Amino acid sequence: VNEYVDARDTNMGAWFEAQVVRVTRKAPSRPALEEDVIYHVKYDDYPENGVVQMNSRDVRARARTIIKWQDLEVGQVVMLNYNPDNPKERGFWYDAEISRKRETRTARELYANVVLGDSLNDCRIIFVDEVFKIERP
């Protein structure tokens, strides 16, 4: 019945849970711009940052579907958790492309190219059971 979205902070490149407050019309600032729509979003866990003005590219339906480990393939673009400054700890949700997958009786390792804005190639993903499917169209 709702109406739930993810908002991408433009400087970290990560996606955060958010809600849409207003939709306004951005009149072109220059002739080489078209009249586009602005989405006014607020972050669910950061209401101190007030409202942010974003475009449709940085707002999308909220991630709901987890891709099981057995169903992860090399080359898929997914939303996973990663911490660039502490790769062994919990981090933020970035879009990434799975680059390497390995499984043994003991270990389950996954490497992906993490998009942050720049790109990070072959990041060792810790949370291989919390890989989300990106919702489209």
Binding site: E17, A63, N81, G91, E130
Partner: peptide
């Protein structure tokens, strides 16, 4: 959807 587990953003 159930809330995701995410770290907290830090200041400079």
């Amino acid at each position: 959807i159930p809330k995701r587990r995410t770290a907290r953003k830090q200041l400079p």
